């Protein structure tokens, strides 16, 4: 050819392989989709400068790289790695501001739902992620560097850069990949007039989340559905010990006031019409006031007429002989 370089190729930053290249074809034709220092260089012709440099490979993986990719990220779809590399580059321009030691994501490219997701996640004690790459990015985020964690969340959530998205959906999809590092139990008593009574126990993190109610009064109320036998089966919470409680419902317009001494510690708000593009806001209760974190813009109020979606309560201690 005309000149030869050697590059190092990785999908995890731990294991690298050497690939010999020339300047007669692009990276994509010789090797595949490659990122150099966070930038896609696949359609460029290799130059003597990049000799010895490292490249992150997003396709054309070898058998060993595919195994390592599964251990690092779990079972992902064929587009996941390229989407994660591209998101990470696109979210590079975002800013994570800190107001009185509270992290918050500035508004940009309709990312307000990510603001509510991140700040809700920052209030969850003792959560840890079971996907190693998701846990590594989490520690980075807790250490002040959120790029990987933001990008990974959007990749696992099938989120698109620039498009608005569902904060509650992404929060629970993220939480489905985590586990609790303490004790939590949730005992549901079920009974049908034909079959009888059976108690059902939920352990760990899933004992701390419920999608369908927004108050602990509705969580503890009696529910009714169809039994396997085909008749009325009932169900009710009879025991609950948690470090906290996340309840998520549809946008529900209520009046939130601090003169009533509310029991929850934080909540997310959906602003606008549900059949239109809405704007998410994260809110916390401090000093007998409502601290609204509108994507890097802080406010304080005593009352707020808003449509809540997620609500976060302190730990639960509950018993009920039903």
């Amino acid at each position: 050819q005309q000149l030869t370089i050697e590059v190092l190729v990785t999908v995890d930053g731990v294991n690298f392989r050497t690939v010999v290249l020339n300047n007669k074809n692009t990276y994509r034709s010789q090797l595949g989709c490659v990122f150099f220092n966070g930038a896609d260089i696949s359609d460029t012709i290799p130059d003597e400068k990049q000799n010895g440099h490292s490249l992150y490979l997003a396709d054309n993986l070898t058998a060993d790289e595919t195994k390592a990719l599964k251990e690092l990220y779990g079972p992902v779809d064929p587009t996941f790695l390229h989407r994660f590399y591209s998101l990470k580059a696109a979210v590079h321009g975002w800013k994570m501001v800190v107001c009185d030691k509270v992290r918050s994501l500035k508004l940009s490219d309709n990312n307000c739902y990510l603001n509510a997701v991140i700040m809700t996640l920052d209030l969850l004690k003792d959560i840890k992620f079971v996907i190693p790459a998701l846990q590594h990015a989490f520690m980075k985020h807790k250490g002040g560097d959120s790029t990987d964690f933001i990008a990974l969340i959007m990749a696992y959530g099938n989120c698109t850069f620039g498009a608005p998205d569902d904060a509650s959906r992404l929060l629970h999809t993220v939480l489905a990949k985590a586990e609790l590092c303490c004790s939590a139990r949730m005992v549901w008593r079920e009974w049908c007039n034909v079959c009888g009574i059976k108690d059902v126990v939920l352990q760990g993190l899933k004992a701390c989340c419920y999608v369908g109610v927004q108050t602990v009064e509705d969580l503890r109320a009696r529910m009714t559905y169809v039994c396997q036998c085909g008749g009325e089966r009932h169900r009710q919470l009879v025991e609950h010990t948690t470090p906290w409680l996340l309840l998520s419902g549809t946008p529900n317009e209520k009046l939130v006031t601090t003169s009533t001494a509310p029991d929850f510690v934080a909540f997310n708000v959906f602003q606008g019409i549900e059949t239109a593009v809405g704007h998410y806001v994260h809110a916390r209760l401090k000093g007998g006031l409502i601290l609204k974190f509108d994507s890097g813009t802080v406010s304080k109020t005593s009352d707020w007429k808003c449509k809540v979606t997620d609500v976060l309560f302190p730990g639960q201690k509950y018993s009920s002989d039903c």
């Binding site: 498009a163 998205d165 569902d166 989340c209 419920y210 169809v226 039994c227 396997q228």
Partner: protein
């Protein structure tokens, strides 16, 4: 195995080994709701695409609740 999906309320014939994505494709087939816009809830848990109905202990005559993805 018959289950109910509350949208109205309709009925699906499924297998315990069917994936959530497989269940979502049937809801699309009968209701025209694209799978990525569907949010399926059961026992207060959001069903993730990669897992099966058996993973969530979904049985005969179980009721799944359908929420639409906001914004989108």
């Amino acid at each position: 195995m018959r289950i109910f999906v509350e949208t109205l309320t309709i009925t699906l014939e499924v297998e315990p080994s069917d994936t959530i994505e497989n269940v979502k494709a049937k809801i699309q087939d009968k209701e025209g709701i694209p799978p990525d816009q569907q949010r399926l809830i059961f026992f207060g848990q959001q069903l993730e695409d990669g897992r099966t109905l058996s993973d969530y202990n979904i049985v005969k005559y179980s009721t799944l609740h359908l929420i639409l993805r906001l914004n989108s």
